[model samples]
Target chain A: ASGGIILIIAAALAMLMANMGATSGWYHDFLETPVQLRVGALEINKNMLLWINDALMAVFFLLIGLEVKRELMQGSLASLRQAAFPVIAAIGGMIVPALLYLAFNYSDPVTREGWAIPAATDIAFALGVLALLGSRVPLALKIFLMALAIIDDLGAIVIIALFYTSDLSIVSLGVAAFAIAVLALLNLCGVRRTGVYILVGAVLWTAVLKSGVHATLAGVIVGFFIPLKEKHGRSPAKRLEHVLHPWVAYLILPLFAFANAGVSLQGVTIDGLTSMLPLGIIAGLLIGRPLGISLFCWLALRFKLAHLPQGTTYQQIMAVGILCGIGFTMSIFIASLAFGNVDPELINWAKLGILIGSLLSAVVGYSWLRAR
Target chain B: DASGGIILIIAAALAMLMANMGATSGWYHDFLETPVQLRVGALEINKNMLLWINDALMAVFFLLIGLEVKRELMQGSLASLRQAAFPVIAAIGGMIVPALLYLAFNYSDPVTREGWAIPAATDIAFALGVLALLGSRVPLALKIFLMALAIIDDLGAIVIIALFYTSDLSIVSLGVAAFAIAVLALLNLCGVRRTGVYILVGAVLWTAVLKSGVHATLAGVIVGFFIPLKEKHGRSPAKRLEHVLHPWVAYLILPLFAFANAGVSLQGVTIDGLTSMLPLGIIAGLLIGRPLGISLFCWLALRFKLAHLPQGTTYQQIMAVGILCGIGFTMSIFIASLAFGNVDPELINWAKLGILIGSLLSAVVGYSWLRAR
Candidate 1:
């Protein structure tokens, strides 16, 4: 726990140093280190950043994959009755938020990339919020939150694949696929080795990246096809992910946050960020997320699309919805990337907007939930 | 699970369709309708792909991430000591094979982009193998395999940063970074939400990519730093990652693979890839990885630097090495990207070589173990 804190501090300081002074080269020197390495066709991206995403985060994702599987197998989404309602509510929930973002930004080319962002809710953060109440929150309510987040995630994936892409690279894509198949064949043959897969996944990520889809997308692709062992006591997904998860959570995300999270403190000035894009997001997350989530879930209850968690009432659920409004981590990260190279001042303003909006939502949401 | 498989099959079919003849224009038509909706500056790219990486595979990563986290938290490294050594070794194993591969490719422009794939591995496939064996294999073995793979992934990350990178844009990094920070003033004041982080990371990715360095590396960096969560949680890393992991796994990996890996069929092949970089990489993968991994592991065991699994005696270890001989999923995919645009038969030939070598090693080693153990 302490180590993670140190990493966060390091990242924050690096950001400050990078964005701040005239003589500061700490951040610059860090980036100066060579980050890519290759051999024959086998390759690796060893940048501190890449290490987090590829190595650490891969482990992280592997773990997350297992958890979802477990949850489906045992927890909130386990039963049809248990899972269906939240899923339906989630559908309404997503449509509302994305529709709102799209409604506002669909016209303006500048703020369009951020639509799917607000459509998402941070589950772990929400879970932490629920955990804060301990017994008061009720187990069913927690389950509802988890199921809702999962549903939101499923919708987000559709949005990404459907809406986000570039010119296709047919030839390269074929190469990537051939490689993935070969990987499958290895698994079929009982090649119960971990190194083989990681090496292969790296290839897939590269080929996929070049093929014009996205790089991280390969993580999921590789994950989905990883042959999960059935009731014979195999459970490889559990093992691989278990070994990898802590690093992903403790090391990778924090490292990434530190490395990429900073805008020059200067750019976050008051006057500059009240522009269109920032204002829209601020309203969308702080105002829109709560409205969309609470209202949609409420409607679903009214129409019988889904029932509330065992102990939860409309008021309590509404508080959880407010918590959903706290779209800080992923939303902020995404918003930062939206205009990273174009203008730093603009990016800073956006970050400032995210911080404020998400914070306000969290405070209110947390307090409301606590009261519940 | 069946649904996921069906989805994958569908994705594969689409990829194949796109490969043969690009998908419906209507699908792509949407991307053009709204390329970006930035709140700040000009964070531009295909919105569709952005969603895929950040949201889809990320979701996929989440499922896997959760599984891994739970396991570690209960047992493994977070649990006890004896179990931890395996992850450490596997990480080392992952590193050596690819590094040797890089050195093998040194005959060409090792410095020029071609040799950058020296250290790489796929955690998903490895974990999947254990998962595939879930019903058949012992839990202990599965645990060991997972540890090895996760460690291997770490090793791959190390090699990527250390080796393939070039520093052509040192000056540009300074210029944009310095200047870019100066530009972020407005983002500060508004107390913007995390959506801003994505915009920022994307810009940084472009800066790092355009100025000189790999484009993909930049993507990972941007995604890592920009992902947001509440600060009050104090344990922000775990909190944010837990929040992000689900989406990263569930939707991202399979869809990305389906979206990306659907091509590379060996429908017709002459010598197109042979004269290109693809063939060379494949050849190296098939031919080089087996001898390299098998011999190295054996040597390490011999030196007492590492321990072999039960029934995984030295000879058995050597024989099983052949199984990996032909295994070139992730590495082959990466190599395909590096070598040629498609999985040309020639590139696959190289992957085939690795597959053959690895498979043979596995066959021999497994048989040896069965006979002697």
Candidate 2:
């Protein structure tokens, strides 16, 4: 009954409920419902949102990993020459926004950690806007947009792995490594059974969850190990991708959007938006995004490292580049990671910056592309 | 890997070990009785950890079973009428003869004889586990033969319980169940292949059946069958689900079931104590009765020229399978819980002991027979 548009609707609903008086408490309490699983010695106790974010989003990341692996293997990212424009564009896109955010928050140690918030492109929302353009947009332009978003996604994944680790447990990491080794051995031993992989992957997930490396990284690792080459005209990775996509696209992604997208506008003012974290995120996404992507792609074209996408002008490329600034989902995800120990009020301010900047980018980018 | 089966063994052993440790025995029993409840609107299910394992997790096990059943019917050994005929006949005999044997020993005691069908089932995992342990000693044909027979026996067991074991039925809940089935059929018609859709509806069906006073696990079998076979890109839902759920059911769910249910405290029970009618009848029905029925039926089918031995399989191998079928573990325990649920505590323990003893004898004897030249 829903898609990316449906997710956007859910986000709107969450925002409405959050701003209302009595129902805001109900909304908050619902998401805070405790869900616990306990066995002999192991216990995982997280509220509903954390389950959706940590547990369910791992499956979502697995799908993302599968998508990236496929693109690299055979799709738009199949060859170096073909991908050079989007690759260089995405690298520039991430670096500039991150630097911009860091520049704004350089004086504050704690708040400065969220430099990657604007470095991402919300693929669903970006594609959602492109989809709104219909066949008026050229196929090459669409492909360019997809390729850039995917590359940007890969960059964000790297950022999360590098910067957002805490409470490292060597013992659990060793167990996680050993579990992964057994999984690799199973693959090497010609074990194509999905059940065995899932069982061992579960062990790896738990170990990683305890080891303090974000458990979602385990999903990416396991997903990459999911054999790309089809067996009997079907691959486990592709099968899982097909099965898990709608659940993610319609359910997990929307639930995530709804859960985090709610910005209670009770005490909002321009003065608050000028804070280090919020200003950094806003400037990073709005200004730094297009400047970085356009310059990098122009550099690649001038050097003859890559050609312009067929039938796509520099204006269309820049339009999609600005559209990449609609960094909502991964932006909110990074905000949570960065403000893990910060004030809820500060996080709310950060969210307000993301919403305003993303909304602005969407309106301008869509109009620019549609006019072209 | 054999590790899944080995894990099941270790869990069952741990359960028994805990039970025998006297002071810790109450803790073991109490742990199984931990209440878990789910409530949504007017619908609610409250069951202990043991009930959840048997009712909920076992439904997942049967979902895997149902997937296997569909796959076997489509492309595997059970594809042919000739291939399927022997197991069908053998399963009937496997069910009836043991049931009859159980009745004979306990006929004088009306309460004791209600468990007549307890010995009539073959635990697929344990039997297959034993066959797998013997490796090349058992031919693939014989293994296929055992698999088909066990599945057919399960089919018989399901029907028996559905027809005979239901308590007072609620017409409203039954109507809701029927409604759920129609929705599932509609989803199948619309080519809805996502497991999530089926799972959501399957939960509804389970709740309805649970309210309808039928065994909740029937929801598993029916929901399993509702999954569509044909899909775009030629993906088989049954095969994919079977592949994914195999390790989960075998290693995790089944082992948990064993750990929770297999603790038979032997404080007062002795070898002599096992001779009481309730235990003896069950023991005899499984140890002697299952093999006799299966082999006799196979002999009759051959004598009547209705079936022939599978290639690379001999009469002795068939006899080995017959003994293996006698290892009625999970299904028997499930039936015991159903049949004498309100009976004396002594009777239930005796029944558990009888099931353990009968299954152990079958495993050891079946292995010995299959291991021989």
Candidate 3:
């Protein structure tokens, strides 16, 4: 919960810093150095962007792994009833954000694939919203949101694999599959050392990062393997979550924000919103996200498929629907990968749209939540 | 600590991405195009390195702020102990590491008036000790050692501000002092809205950067002021720590590492570490650090000033103590700045020598600690 707000501050600070009056070639130099790890013929050197995207952010998936593990063991998704509403809603939420973005930007070559980026809400940020509300929001509301967000992340991860992948490298893919199999076998054989998993996961991540797939998937796959509810002295979820939170909130995120977040400000104007790129992001967040989340949830509720959080009315749900729509980060990261480096003069305009749209939705969501 | 590590990893990734095999030019082109900010004349673009150095690493400082604040409130220094060994020892120990770094480095240079670069090292690798030691050492001993290492970090920050900062921007300094005073004055004169403090601190940080002869004192100072001190009505340690920890650890430190550490390599290693600039780091870390640490620690113990754990006997302590002096992170960074842009190969060589020596010393120190058992 606190982790979400921590990430927010990290992203916000990066945004504020990029706009601040400071300059040095170091970070650029730093970001530019392709990180290489060599072990004889098993050498690896990918662009820093790709490494972080695939390699480092795998740890973030490790956190997700533990979270998922916990859910299966003792958390809300431990059974069917707890999962039904959010799982269905999460599916609806994921599909709607993309459809909205695509509707606006489909024909625009520069920013088309970015459609799927805004489809998911990172649980950390969502929880941050709940924490900010303090006593006013019920514990039940918080619980629902957490389960809903986790499912939502799973859906987003899947989309990245199915839709957002690059030219498939069969050799790399086979190597990745082999590595993953070893990882699975280790788990089955009751391997206990976290270090072993990390080393194996690192190799797995490298293979996949080189495989031309979105890097975050490495995190998801590794996360999926790390059992969360171990009955021994250390539960996998607790160990991984505690260990990885700092990495996610402070480092991977801030660094991501710094690099991916950096867009040359030479051409973005208010008028650019009319351009297809920004329009898609804006339309997706403001129009698509809220519409889909609320409509689906409303229908689900009416059909007696799901119950409301205690002390929360449908009007309150409307506010949350808007809150759920604020998707800035996942969208931008995916955009950078899909767009690669050469294509867009107006990519920044689209990013600016993301910032503005998310900010606007957050404002509206918080306002309604406060009013209720 | 974990926060610092993560930030470094992130930066490392970004670095790798930009330096892609097929796409070097595009990465550089994008970086150059993105000016640090859209500010006016003086408060202008912070280059990519500038962002990580001050802004990102400062987040590490914020994390420490949280740790220290929490420690004081619940456990050690801030909690009102007459004499807590770890914190007191750690505070002083922290200072010594950095100060020792400068004192060793200020060899006839205009440390007071010459170079603008500060002595630093403590990359994530150095600051965060074995992520998880599968060693047979006691956890308590490990904790104490780490406490000392972190203390070294605080000392390094102070030294950077006091020593390396140029006095070129007096107006900026005056403005910062004014801003800081305004903050205190607001609390004294009117009231203290956390938001109000947040807003003013930004102004203060900017002024500090303008005046403080440093790159961006404001980065740390602004954040130092405005972070939330506590939740809605608990004692303020959590809030204070959160404010400090959030920015410094989460944002500043690792990014700083990335920005600073990610130097574009000069192709292949034509020269060996000894002949090249890397040697200075090695020698310094190995030769000076190890001996200095071991000698001083033994000298202190023989006099009965402080206590030693019962891991090993006197002989073992010396070896491990030597190893601990291998903590050359802050010093290594300072050398990195000097070594930046392939200066005289000799300059870096000597600096690298120093670092190697220090690292060797740490290994020895770690072994000694374990062997003492």
Candidate 4:
């Protein structure tokens, strides 16, 4: 929630800077500045945005990895009974919005590829909205929302790796294969050194880039592979997760929003909102998320595949679904990747839609959850 | 030390390959030249990305160094004059002789003479790196001596950059800097030791110094020195900041600096041309002068009973220490950048070539000598 509030401010500042006449010119250009890193025959030379999106976001995903690992190992999502609610709801949430986005965008191949844009939920924003209801909300509903968002995070991760990766090379795949084998071997040997894992992960990260997968997946791979329990009774995954969370929350997310969210308001039109891409994402999040989440969850309860949280009603469950439409951080990341080949103007249009959709969802979600 | 050293070598090799290649050569070159500008109201600071890394990122490196220095001064290796004598005298010997040798080569040329200090400072990481590989074979006394010597080497580099590399000053800006210093001094006097507040004022000091025609990096040194050792119940901002900054400087700033500056186009060069006065001067100064000067000064200090040799360390080891000090990659390149900022582009290239060759020679020679032990 702290991350959400900070991002809200940082993004507003960036947009204001972008819309202002003088600052807007170099504002984009500054972000476009190239930064090159080289070692031996290996070189990564990219503009600043690529570094932030690729490298910094990889680290952010690593935090997500630790979270995913911990919850599966010991937390709220540890069992079938515990996991059934979130897993079913998350699938519903992802599939339905994507279908909605496709309904609007399927005619244009380029825009159609952005099917996952609004399928994500910003956990911080959703939880922040839930937190507003305070004592007005039932405790089980809050747990349901939290658990659902975390599962939603895992869904996003799998989607990114499975669907969004580009540029495949056989030789690089071999390298990544070797790297993963080495990491697995180290784990089998019960090697618990965090620094060793980090060093080994660098090889995997490089290879993943070469293999045409988005390099950030390596962070998730390494994150999951971190030793869950150590010889001395400490959990390496938990230790790493604890250290990384504050940095990811306080710094990386805010910095990303500040840099990525600024789409110039100049020359914007009402027609742009109704344009296929923006309309698709809007319909997906504000409508598809709630309809899909509630519908799937209702079916799960009816069939006894899952049970509703102890103090929550069908209305409250759907209210949480509306809150899930606050697809801010994870959504922007997907939009960046999905529209990687598109014009900057088109990308900006999508960002504007995300902002409008997310804001509307937050306001309406908070109000509905607040009322009896 | 080896990890950092190996990483440095790898970064350099890639840079060299890119510099020599066809399309890739210009790709790296153009990336370094990308414009980066930051503006606040009417004030704006603008530079290419390379300068941004060299000037701004390196200040953070110096901040870490300053913290390390103060910590050592307060309680570490240089806690007393007796503990400090061997390294202190050794640092003097190491700095003076190479500088004199460089001056000897270039004293006739007014412009080239400014580069005498370039070869004088050591790359502490490179030197300590050689020592780390030697391991338990190296005595505790010898290891301490080398570590202490390297820290003093950093001190000398910081001082030389301050005294020699400063450009012409703007008085009003200098006055602004002076005022910031006074405020800092007053803060120190009043024991106003909040880390965030010091950093806020330090930004003002940095801007003032940058406008005053001094290198803006001096702000890091000044801010570092004034950071109180202990604040508000044993919370040490200096120590805390240093710990946070170490991996950043070691793994990021230095590597970035190397990649940005190590791009040397090697085409159209012959041996006769390579042995020009500036390059030759730097080469001779670093390769021969470091050991000779260091050993000679040590001998003199021992003869006069000023300081005794560290236990279990031979004269050969001292000579090895001198060679290790000659691995002047980081400081030499930085000083070269400063000294040749306004010189001909050809001279700058020559300075880069000399630094590479000289540092390579020192590392090999130093390592082989230590390995014999």
Best by lDDT: 2
DockQ of 3: 0.03
lDDT per residue (tens digit) for residues A1-372 in model 4: 466677688889889878888889788887777665543344455666766677767888788778777778787677778788878998899899999999998898878877888888887677666665565668777677767876666566567667566656687778888888988998899988786788788888876653222577788889988989856779888888887876776777888888888889877788878988888888888999998999899999889888667776688899889999988877887787777756876678788888888998998887876677
Q: DockQ scores for all the models shown?
A: 0.03, 0.08, 0.03, 0.04
Of all native A–B interface contacts, model 1 reproduces a fraction of 0.00
Q: Which stretches of candidate 1 lie over 4 Å from their true place?
A: A1-61, A78-80, A102-107, A133-136, A179-199, A211-213, A227-234, A336-347, B1-373
CAPRI band for model 4: incorrect
Q: How well does candidate 4 score on lDDT at residue A3?
A: 60
- Model 4, C-alpha of A8: deviation from truth (Å): 1.7
Going through the candidates in order, what is the number of backbone clashes in each?
220, 0, 103, 2
Q: State interface RMSD in Å for all models.
A: 14.7, 5.7, 17.0, 11.1
**Top candidate by TM-score:** 2
Q: For residues A259-347, write the lDDT of model 2, one tens digit per residue.
A: 98987888877888887788888888888898799989988888878767788678788888888888888788767767765676767
DockQ winner, 1 or 2: 2
What are the per-residue Cα lDDT tens digits for candidate 4 across B1-373? Answer: 4676666667778788888889888888777767665443344455556666687766776777777777777777776767668778878988788889998888899999888877777776667766777765677777677767776766676566677576665687778888888888888788875665677678888877663222577678788888888756878778887776776677777777777788888998789876888988888888888878888888888889888787788877777888877877876787787777756867878998998899899889888877886
Which order, best to worst by TM-score? 2, 4, 3, 1
Tens-digit lDDT track of model 1 for B76-194: 34335545444445445544675556455544643323433422443344323323332243344443454445434533453354345433445655566545444443443444444
Selected candidate, larger DockQ, 3 vs 4 = 4
Candidate 3, superposed: residue stretches over 4 Å from native: A1-8, A24-46, A211-214, A264-267, A307-312, B1-373
What clash pairs does model 4 have? A40-B10, A167-A212
